[PDB]
């Protein structure tokens, strides 16, 4: 099923852009997974921080970035491209606020980020960015919001999404979760993200093996739960 | 195809109306045609009909009868069979079909 | 495999695309140019009308300036575009330098127009070998022949198009100072020269003659018929 | 198929090769087994290139030493008209040169014949590269 | 590895300038002898047909009043360089009010040569012999498409260069006169020439220091040849 | 294989085959021997002649009154790089009114040379240069192979059949520092005369010497000018 | 045509620009949208079915407005839809600032199609693989145009792109009477989709817009639920 | 094959091969290591003198990006010098744009983005040099960053780039770099490097060091000649 | 093979892409313009005539370039729009610059150069659109011009392009009328030619499209006859057809 | 690999060898080693479990290996004591070891034609051109 492929601008005979297709298969080359769960008034993103060395400066091995004071993003996929996508976003929001007088809603920031990725799929100049972004933000008039922008430029509004090597089970796990409708309390949402990531991998999730981000309607600011809190949260999940 | 090996290069074109009619009469000679079975009108319904397809109308017009246990083939038995054998495939796409004005 | 580009030399120092380009000129109608003492005649054969299309939109002999006419061979699409540029060049030089263009300069420009197209890829050469004839030299008649390669050449008599080999061979052995000595004699030569027309119809020969400080004169199909007749009458001496 | 029959005949030759010296000629070396062209069997690979000019005037004199040519022939000149010509097509230029001297009953194959020879043997089959497409070179 | 001026062969060669360099061999023989008296310059016209005016075939062209040009190869390319040659020497006079040296012009034309793949085309399919007299003395300069510009006491370009050059090495020595250089060159050209040498087949042109005029030979080419 | 047509493709073994090939350009030209002493920078070039009666090719170019170079590679590229240096030094003299140091020039030559090795549209400069100049920090001898890498050399020998010239110099490197003008050059000519085939010996027509010293600008000794350095040269054993 | 399939600027030996065709394959394999022009207005429909319950159905809307009187429905690569709409709203806007009247639906498609044709004239830009249905009510007559990746804009009365399009057209030509009214038209439009949408027509699974005399508007989930309940 | 010729083409398994090859050409370079002391970072690079004729200290791999930052390119040198020049133009534009020294992290991020900028276009090839950045600042501690060809840049307590990466961490992993002041680290970085570089291969070599921290007062300049001499002696005594 | 780029010359000297392009016109609809004194007509065919297709323009194949210039199209839809867009812009520039209508032929040359220019510079696909032009001027009155994808144009007295061009062109010859080309005779022939050239018989009125150009009181009305008059036109030919059968 | 053709005789030879190889177990002093230059044509059966399974990989030598390899085949010759075998390796790439011997043997020959005893560095380089059939010509555009 290789197709004409070797060029992103040449359609396969069936109408499938193979080069764009291969983008997603590059997405899981990062070997990690991030899950975002939207609660009643919060959205929690949990990622895998597998630091394969005692020499690595653990402070800078983070997959979580702060796009803006109210919107936080996690990258799943190639670290280099994910970094560029993060950096391109920050300008896109800052241009949004500077241009219209207010902070860019998390809705568009994936749209503009998606729109940038889409033109790289038509004009055979830039090789596509091989990383999916998840934007979480407390949006006024629409509660907490989560979005996942893919290499081909498709973004959607997700009650919960996960991108990474174990996406099929992560989404199946969440799909099992969201349906038995429950009061998604901030504690419930943070717990839900941890369980989702834990069940798929089958890991204990030592305190430092993940990086959970949290955004709540009460304090609409992007925060990364400090290692003490995840342990407290993790112990809460156990009991 | 150089003269000396293939001298005459005889062309066999799809039959005309006075040729489809003749074909429809050589393969329906053994058939139990009714009265009022205008083999020409059937022929006029079959523009550019190969010539072996014309027999397909005769086998099919006769096949529409064997499912009814008869021996006589009427006109509607034909016109309903000139649509089956002489069937066509359309582009089934307006997107492609207007590519060319 | 050294023939699918314009600036790729073959192992033996050949620009094969330019060589292929002169293949179009050999596939046009025969155009003969003979320069006389006071009337530089240039003819076109294989008029080959369609019996249902007016011949005005067929013109193949065009006057580049008031003193220089240009009869081409090759492919028509490019012939119109070259003539239009040359016509603009003849006037533009006139404005830049008061004196009007000479025949040699316009040929140098035309050769300068073609050459810049064969020098670089992504641009196809003009496939026309044009016969540049004109008295504008202000005293001396002069007829040149261009080449889709880009080299302009001066001939006292020429033959371009489908039949140059036949016309040229028959032209050298019949061109002399005695022949050109007379104006009507000069035209009789070209009509005789192009009389070796693919079918020798005698009715599809179009000769145009320009004279010292004169104006171009597309011979009417009554003077040509007379000249075609007169030449026939002169040829009637065989018996 | 029986092809492997021939191949096992080469492998019985590769084993054999690797006071006995061995020669081999191949106008198309690229079709030879890489094993049989290694420097453990064919230690030396002589390339017979197209002659240079100082050799073509020598290949000519070798085949014309028995021809009935006129004393003067500018063989050096006939070497530059046969560019990229092999050591044999030089021979047919000498064989055609006489055939032009036999067609017309001259018992001395003059120089004019050779240029007529080099037009038929070399040029006549060299390339198109003709006047209309050769008025670009001067 | 021979499909652009940008690709290098494993042996280190640009297999495109060479093919351009091969394009000269399909040219016409031109000989150059530099003599203390002056520099001689001859070329085989190779008229395509009697109809063509001999003056339309430009094989020796005048760069300026002091340095002629001998060419061989693609006519269009050589013209594109010639006009690049006439202009610069005039410019060198305009901006410097002096006659440009032969080595100075041949630097100019070659500077255009070193651009086939040195911009940001194809190696010009012509090499030039530049004859002229400068402050240092009389002097002949030869250049090829590859862009090397070098000086030759006596050089021949075009087809038969190998034979002409070797036949020139034997007959040339530092102490020629202009008259003796011309005769040896014509004997060389007539020797290596395919048609019987005469007044219309070839064209000579000489540039003496004191006779910088007459950068051609018109109808006295007959007189020179008849005494061969 | 198929990865060896463009400099913009990485070979499986981690090499950029085009640069490796350009590297091969240097060995094509006639070898040049470059050696500096504590007091002078002298580089000897073995000129070549196209034909018997043709003048021999210039191998030592003039980069500035304090920086001279030897070219072993393409004729067109060597000229292009020589033009750049002179323009670079001319601005450096015009802007800072100071002699631009050889180290700064060599660094800039590499930077201009490295762009071709990374962006399609141009070919690697097939010119290997021995940059010889005298700045305020002593005489220097730099070499820039076409791969855009320049090594600070005590003495280097690039060009056809060069490895002989290198092997003589490495054998006599230690003595090079305490050299007088003539002794240093008589070494270098000895180096070039190692590269020459047994039949060929260093003649006044095929060797050009370029020496830059404490109070001396880059003087290009050729033809008779070479003789004063050539004179006194020791005969090769045979 | 075998080797000429790739480049969009090289005619095949049969005069077939294949790449445009393959792009039209991407349209013919996209979300089904249906359009019906009732004498009272224009109704458009498309199935907004997500791949799991994890999605927020209201996030991305397919049936969209351009101006107050034009809307679009697409069947093809989504993200290539958005780039189309923006050059559509801008183009619809650039008409307003210059002429000050709402852009006639004929012109918008003439220039929303001419946007498409721009990307199909050079190598290095893929064709817009999303067929578009444009509804509008201008000069008192409902309009329904289809602009294609090939650059040709039609004047459809009622059609349907996307998966199972052949069947959808057959349902039309059957239950399409040129003399309906917008109220009946919505029922027909929903039914045409019903022939392919593999599932219950949940109010967050089908998105319908009505281009009437007053202007185009993406139907709120309820009203469709009022409509869907009736049909079922 | 097929997908390995252009940097902009994704293999069906989903990776840019060109980047992988370049990162696997850095494996063919001289070993380079970096250890960050409690108040600084130390860089020690093995330099293989390829022939007795290059003067001492030539084609050096220890660069100064800015006043306080350090570079220790490991890989194809010519590509490194290019990466050095870009870094300085990035720093120089920084100091002139923001009035203070560009923080190591931001210099690595901008320099990392530039490196990743060349693995996106077919008209260019990915850089073949992976380099370590080191600096020390009273307001920012000591930071060490390794920018591999692919564009990833995250800091390391101690890292090695070159042939002996795995061999170099192993003996670096057995040091408490968190505490020892790089006064004593230089004796340790030099001691490490001699453990790597098996003599039987690669023949002769030379070692260049540099440090950033309080000891330097915030600069990166090369370790004073006196200090190195004992350091090399100190490492040499560890033959057993 | 040398059909990869529009600027590559085949060894025989043929720009294959242009042969491929102009040959591509075959797949397109048929347009014909008959000989006519005091007029000239275009007749096109609406190849796609499905039912659900709302007719909003009524002139899918006939465009009006200038106040006295009309041109049909036979080829790619996308390219047809861009050429018809460039055609009008060229004609109106001439009116602005000279305050005089663009005299027909200079309109074709302007477009033909644009079309040809594509056949010279690489990277642009040869316009696959031939288009009939009719009109009037003060210079030669009614004229007919046949544009080709390869840029070459040419005046014509009666021509057909696209589907079954051969059948139409020959018959337009077979009954070709010179001098005696009154409009009525042109209409009868034009529908008469479409009868066999158009495979589907009965030349159903809606399936044909005639636009005529006449010089009325110096106004040059360009007409697109409505279905009603076509019905009587088809009927007028239809009545004439039956009388011919009397031979038997 | 495999293929009533006339190759049903060698097929019996292979299966016979295939038979015995699995016949005897390890722990024995019958260790087997087989050499092939084309391992893409061998039967998979020949290399499965109890047959030649631990397969030895012989590479085309690297640059350092080539410098050594060109030494071993030069010991029995009077090569000059100044012959930078290392430099020779750099010029000798894509060279199979046997070809790496060809340079040595060719190097001695090239000296012979020149009437020398010790093979100079140049002689070795001329071999590196004549081992691959190349003919070194001083092309003019270099200078």
Numbering used by the authors:
A (entry chain G): 6 to 244
B (entry chain C): 306 to 406
C (entry chain J): 2 to 240
D (entry chain A): 290 to 307, 314 to 433
E (entry chain K): 8 to 127, 134 to 241
F (entry chain L): 4 to 241
G (entry chain H): 3 to 234
H (entry chain M): 5 to 244
What does the original paper state about this entry?
The 26S proteasome unfolds and degrades hundreds of proteins to maintain proteostasis, regulate cellular processes and generate peptides with second messenger functions. It consists of a 20S core particle (CP) capped by one or two 19S regulatory particles (RPs) that gate access to the CP proteolytic chamber. It uses its C-terminal PITH (proteasome-interacting TRX) domain for binding, while potentially reducing disulfide bonds with its N-terminal TRX domain but how it binds and is regulated remained unclear.
We refer to these PSs based on the highest substrate-engaged Rpt subunit in the staircase as PSRpt1, PSRpt5, PSRpt4, PSRpt3, PSRpt6 and PSRpt2, represented by ~19,300, ~112,200, ~29,500, ~32,200, ~24,200 and ~73,100 particles, respectively. They all show typical characteristics of the substrate-engaged proteasome, with a shifted and rotated lid subcomplex, the Rpt4/Rpt5 coiled coil positioned near Rpn10, a coaxial alignment of the ATPase ring with the open-gated 20S CP and the substrate polypeptide threaded through the central channel. In PSRpt1, five subunits, Rpt1, Rpt2, Rpt6, Rpt3 and Rpt4, engage the substate and Rpt5 is the seam subunit, albeit at the top of the spiral staircase, ATP bound and ready to engage. There are four subunits, Rpt5, Rpt1, Rpt2 and Rpt6, bound to ATP, while Rpt3 and Rpt4 are ADP bound. By contrast, in PS proteasomes, the PITH domain gains high affinity through additional interactions of its C-terminal tail with Rpn11’s catalytic groove and a coordination of the active-site Zn+.
